[PDB]
Write a protein that binds this ligand. Structure first.
Ligand code: FAD
Length: 296
């Protein structure tokens, strides 16, 4: 029995040994120059060969071989477009990718393999894709569900997928009528991803969509604390905690592994205040399919 849209999903139609080869249509840098690090939105053609659903991921096998002459390991990217896609025809797939650049022990600059390959793609270049992968981040079946979404950085990707479906499309069997609430935590204003799209959805369904941004390096709460995502949530603590108590509420979290801890800290306190052990409560939520997490 699922509370999620699991029926008839496709998983691993394409595999590492037999990937689907698509072509890049567009590749755009979507963060401003200020932004610490670039993030690119890219669209690939798949001609309807990859029957994905909102919340799933695709694997990307970057070109080249590892130090042993073997093909690079695949990396997973949450799909950032809804099932019909950015063009409404179910033939393209979009990804949201941050370019990874760090320094090794010797002070030498290392670029992540897959992220730099993807961000460097030019229209017309081919790309090896696997999947779809995943069941954890699918949408609830309930069209009247209260859906709370908390992403950091690229974790915004599956929520864009959800929201395009909910608010930018007409479906014969699905009309969203609940409350969708998005919190997005980034470091700078030049790093707010898809703000413009979310701003248009808000105007469209003002009673069905709430939006909150947390720009850490540019916002502080009263104590003077940095505006991290949990720092922004705490401000709605009483409201969110009350929302968590209802059977039709669904929590999804996606982004950097770090975020998990700072929300747990906020939650352990709200629950204890009511005589509840957060660890056991979160466990029950996870089992009821209401606390969904994908951090990396
Ligand atoms: C379910 C899922 C969905 C994902 N969705 C997305 C998405 O939508 N967008 C996205 O950008 N990524 C996403 N990722 C992450 C993505 O899969 C890649 O890991 C990421 O793009 C970097 O891979 P790479 O090949 O560029 O790096 P690699 O070449 O594999 O390099 C990674 C390695 O770099 C090292 N490293 C990183 N930072 C440092 C540092 N500061 N100092 C030292 N060593 C360091 C780590 O040891 C790590 O093993 C997702 C991951 C998962 C599991």
């Amino acid at each position: 029995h699922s509370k999620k849209m699991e029926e008839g999903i496709t998983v691993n139609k394409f595999k590492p040994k037999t990937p689907y080869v698509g072509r890049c249509l567009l590749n755009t840098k979507i963060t401003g120059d200020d932004a610490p690090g670039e993030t690119w939105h890219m669209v690939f053609s798949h001609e309807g060969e990859i029957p994905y659903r909102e919340g799933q991921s695709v694997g990307v096998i970057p070109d080249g071989e590892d130090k042993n002459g073997k093909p690079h390991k695949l990396r997973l990217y949450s799909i950032a477009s809804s099932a019909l896609g950015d063009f409404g025809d179910a033939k393209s797939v979009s990804l949201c990718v941050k370019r990874l650049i760090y320094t090794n022990d010797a002070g030498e600059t290392i670029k992540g393999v897959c992220s730099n390959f993807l961000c460097d793609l030019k229209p017309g270049a081919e790309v090896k894709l696997t999947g779809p992968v995943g069941k954890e981040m699918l949408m609830p079946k309930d069209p009247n569900a209260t859906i709370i979404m908390l992403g950091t950085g690229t974790g915004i990707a599956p929520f864009r997928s959800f929201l395009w479906k909910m608010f930018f499309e007409k479906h014969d069997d699905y009309k969203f009528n609940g409350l969708a609430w998005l919190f997005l935590g980034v470091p700078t204003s030049s790093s707010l991803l898809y703000k413009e799209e979310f701003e248009k959805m808000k105007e469209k369904a003002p009673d069905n969509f709430r939006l909150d941004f947390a720009v850490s390096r540019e916002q502080t709460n009263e104590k003077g604390e940095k505006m991290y995502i949990q720092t922004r949530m705490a401000q709605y603590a009483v409201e969110l905690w009350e929302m968590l108590k209802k059977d039709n509420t669904y929590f999804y979290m996606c982004g950097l592994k770090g975020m998990e801890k700072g929300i747990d800290d906020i939650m352990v306190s709200l629950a204890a205040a009511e005589g509840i052990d957060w660890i056991e409560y979160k466990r029950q939520l996870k089992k009821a399919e209401q606390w969904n997490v994908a951090v990396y």
